[PDB]
Amino acid sequence: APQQINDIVHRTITPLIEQQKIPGMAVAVIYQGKPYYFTWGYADIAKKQPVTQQTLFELGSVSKTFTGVLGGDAIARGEIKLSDPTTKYWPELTAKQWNGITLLHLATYTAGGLPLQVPDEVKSSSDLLRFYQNWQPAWAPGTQRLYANSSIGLFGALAVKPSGLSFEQAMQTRVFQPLKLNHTWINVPPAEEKNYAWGYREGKAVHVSPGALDAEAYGVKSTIEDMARWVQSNLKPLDINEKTLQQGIQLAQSRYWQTGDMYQGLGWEMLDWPVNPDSIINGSDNKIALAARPVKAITPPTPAVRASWVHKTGATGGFGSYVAFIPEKELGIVMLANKNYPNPARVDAAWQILNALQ
Ligand SMILES: CC(=O)c1ccc(N2C[C@@H](C(=O)O)CC2=O)cc1
Numbered sequence: 001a002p003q004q005i006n007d008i009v010h011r012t013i014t015p016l017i018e019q020q021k022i023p024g025m026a027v028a029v030i031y032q033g034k035p036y037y038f039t040w041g042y043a044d045i046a047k048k049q050p051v052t053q054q055t056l057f058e059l060g061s062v063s064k065t066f067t068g069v070l071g072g073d074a075i076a077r078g079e080i081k082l083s084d085p086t087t088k089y090w091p092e093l094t095a096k097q098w099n100g101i102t103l104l105h106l107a108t109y110t111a112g113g114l115p116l117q118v119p120d121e122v123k124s125s126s127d128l129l130r131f132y133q134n135w136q137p138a139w140a141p142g143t144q145r146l147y148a149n150s151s152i153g154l155f156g157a158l159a160v161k162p163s164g165l166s167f168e169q170a171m172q173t174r175v176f177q178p179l180k181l182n183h184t185w186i187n188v189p190p191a192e193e194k195n196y197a198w199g200y201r202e203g204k205a206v207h208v209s210p211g212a213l214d215a216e217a218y219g220v221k222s223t224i225e226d227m228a229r230w231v232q233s234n235l236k237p238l239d240i241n242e243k244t245l246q247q248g249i250q251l252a253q254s255r256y257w258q259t260g261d262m263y264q265g266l267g268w269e270m271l272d273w274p275v276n277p278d279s280i281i282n283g284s285d286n287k288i289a290l291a292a293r294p295v296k297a298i299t300p301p302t303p304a305v306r307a308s309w310v311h312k313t314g315a316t317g318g319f320g321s322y323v324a325f326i327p328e329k330e331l332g333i334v335m336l337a338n339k340n341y342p343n344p345a346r347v348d349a350a351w352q353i354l355n356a357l358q
Pocket of ligand 1: 116147287288289290291
């Protein structure tokens with residue numbers, strides 16, 4: 001690797017691992033479109049398995065970027081429209097409060113205060129219908145952003161309905177396969193078990209628990225190589241041969257809403273580059289609090305802006321992940337760890353690395 005990359009990565013990540021007591025970590029830096037890999041520590045402490053380029057990590061909420069792109073692909077295929085009422089694709093959602101709530105609102109956490117989690121008690125499709133029927137919005141649709149797995153989760157489930165495919169089937173055939181993400185999974189197959197890192201929470205080895213709409217929201221597991229490829233695809237969508245997928249990526253990076261300096265995409269989130277990193281490290285967009293923020297509609301959405309800091313953070317009980325890239329500069333980073341640690345620390349490291357290389 002170029003020595004500048006080697007040096008900035010090792011000098012930034014090594015103390016991060018110390019400070020945060022992270023058992024294992026993988027990092028990819030995309031520089032001038034080409035990936036460079038770095039690993040530390042252990043995928044499995046008890047069995048002394050090292051982190052490698054083939055180690056599978058739980059992406060947690062970084063999964064939403066895949067959901068956003070799959071949804072974008074569905075729009076490009078003419079199967080759904082983001083302007084469509086939720087009830088067009090779920091006719092049994094007859095409750096009044098659903099009047100005026102569109103697929104756009106679900107995809108961007110702006111439906112009017114859908115809760116963070118689908119309750120663990122929801123097990124059947126009937127249970128799921130009752131949950132959404134009984135939910136009472138705090139705000140009119142398209143006025144406030146409140147991060148919610150129940151929001152984008154429902155978007156994901158509904159987006160695939162016209163295809164007749166299950167969410168998994170659609171993600172595999174329309175996103176993973178075409179992009180050659182052959183070590184990226186919604187359900188980790190037995191063949192890949194040996195590569196699946198354990199997450200660590202309070203010293204215990206843990207994997208993510210199953211839940212309703214888990215696949216759509218926080219269900220993807222992937223290697224550092226595959227995540228690098230994902231970043232490459234998002235940095236330069238025009239190099240992708242499948243036309244609906246290329247368009248899907250572009251739609252996911254469009255700017256639909258603004259809060260402060262932040263713009264909400266489909267899964268992806270964006271800030272204008274050059275970035276003042278204060279808001280994403282210390283301020284209103286540092287992701288520590290669950291925050292209800294008034295949004296200003298971008299009418300219509302600005303197409304993918306090349307000079308953007310495009311990013312998503314993610315966690316599960318036992319994992320922490322971060323992805324950021326700057327299309328203009330052909331530059332990106334992926335950070336995967338098998339311990340959940342604070343988002344501001346993750347963003348601080350990513351900024352330090354990318355700012356040095358930009
Ligand atoms: C305290 C808490 O449960 C909590 C849950 C989710 C979040 N959010 C809100 C999201 C965001 O604001 O970007 C991301 C994220 O993890 C923040 C706090």
